[PDB]
Amino acid sequence: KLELRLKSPVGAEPAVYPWPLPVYDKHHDAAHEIIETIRWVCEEIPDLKLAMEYDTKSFESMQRLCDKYNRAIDSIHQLWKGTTQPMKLNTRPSTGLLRHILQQVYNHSVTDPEKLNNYEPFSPEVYGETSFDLVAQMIDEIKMTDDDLFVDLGSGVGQVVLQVAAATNCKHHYGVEKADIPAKYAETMDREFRKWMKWYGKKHAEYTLERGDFLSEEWRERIANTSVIFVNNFAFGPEVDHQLKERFANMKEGGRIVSSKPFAPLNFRINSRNLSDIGTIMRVVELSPLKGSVSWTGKPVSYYLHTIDRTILENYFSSLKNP
Numbered sequence: 001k002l003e004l005r006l007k008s009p010v011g012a013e014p015a016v017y018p019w020p021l022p023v024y025d026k027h028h029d030a031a032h033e034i035i036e037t038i039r040w041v042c043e044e045i046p047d048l049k050l051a052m053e054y055d056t057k058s059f060e061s062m063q064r065l066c067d068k069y070n071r072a073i074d075s076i077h078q079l080w081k082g083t084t085q086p087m088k089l090n091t092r093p094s095t096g097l098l099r100h101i102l103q104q105v106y107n108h109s110v111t112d113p114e115k116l117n118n119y120e121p122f123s124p125e126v127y128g129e130t131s132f133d134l135v136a137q138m139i140d141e142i143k144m145t146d147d148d149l150f151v152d153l154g155s156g157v158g159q160v161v162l163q164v165a166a167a168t169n170c171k172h173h174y175g176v177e178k179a180d181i182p183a184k185y186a187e188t189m190d191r192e193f194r195k196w197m198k199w200y201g202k203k204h205a206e207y208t209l210e211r212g213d214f215l216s217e218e219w220r221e222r223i224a225n226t227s228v229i230f231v232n233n234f235a236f237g238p239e240v241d242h243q244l245k246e247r248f249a250n251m252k253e254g255g256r257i258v259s260s261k262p263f264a265p266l267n268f269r270i271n272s273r274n275l276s277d278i279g280t281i282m283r284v285v286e287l288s289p290l291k292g293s294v295s296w297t298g299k300p301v302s303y304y305l306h307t308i309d310r311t312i313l314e315n316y317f318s319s320l321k322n323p
């Protein structure tokens with residue numbers, strides 16, 4: 001054998017689900033993924049929504065839903081052979097669809113999520129996921145163009161890179177991750193993302209997910225030539241952050257770093273004793289908290305935007321030529 005099938009709206013291979021349908025965690029299962037998938041394709045195609053205008057325990061009841069969607073997809077496909085313009089194919093997903101796609105990719109890839117908590121505590125290996133909503137905020141505030149290169153340093157299972165790649169026109173997106181468990185899941189995330197995006201008929205920008213160490217010699221130059229870095233450095237600690245500062249000091253004017261802990265103080269005043277500090281070459285601002293997003297600390301969740309700006313330093317030196 002028994003199985004359920006959803007035809008792609010753009011004629012990719014159908015999505016196949018075994019029966020009984022699996023459960024992913026306390027709040028996500030495959031039956032709900034199916035209903036939401038039908039729902040989202042309905043948002044991509046008005047005619048399908050019109051054609052679609054009820055029990056997850058029952059095989060028959062779910063086959064009935066799948067067949068009703070599949071028959072409607074067949075009629076849409078015939079509409080497209082007639083006068084009707086077929087859905088535009090080269091487009092990015094809406095934010096809503098993207099959220100659903102990443103959820104689905106994660107659930108099909110991260111087969112045993114508890115294995116992601118088998119890091120050494122109190123180490124730079126601590127794993128935590130940045131939320132979809134934070135990443136969406138960064139995407140909206142940090143305008144990227146096709147001149148930009150994007151890197152997630154310590155990319156985990158890769159979902160920050162996938163979201164940015166789906167949403168922006170950067171020339172390339174990278175993630176680099178050192179630990180074996182998340183880098184292995186990242187390989188599946190990559191394959192599942194490419195598959196599901198083709199299924200929905202949606203475009204992404206170029207991206208690569210790599211197993212590596214972002215403190216390596218190779219990565220010094222890569223960081224220097226990156227225009228937008230995302231780095232969830234909340235548990236990296238002061239030694240690792242110091243090393244990252246050494247690498248950021250070679251970035252180009254206007255390069256930007258978005259992070260969970262600031263690399264320089266927000267109140268940095270250049271003076272005689274701090275000439276060497278990375279605060280001499282960057283503006284730092286705290287991004288606006290998203291409404292009602294509390295951290296474990298109780299206070300709202302804090303991300304920081306750093307912009308490389310050596311005029312700070314140039315002006316310090318021009319000032320020393322004056323009383």
Ligand SMILES: N#Cc1cn([C@@H]2O[C@H](CSCC[C@H](N)C(=O)O)[C@@H](O)[C@H]2O)c2ncnc(N)c12
Pocket residue numbers: 124125126127128129130131152153154155156157160176177178179182212213214215232236240
């Ligand atoms: N020091 C150090 C290192 C620590 N990481 C990784 O950074 C991650 C921080 S969790 C953030 C995950 C995702 N970007 C998100 O925000 O949702 C962990 O997976 C850890 O293994 C590294 N990876 C590559 N090279 C390194 N040198 C390190």
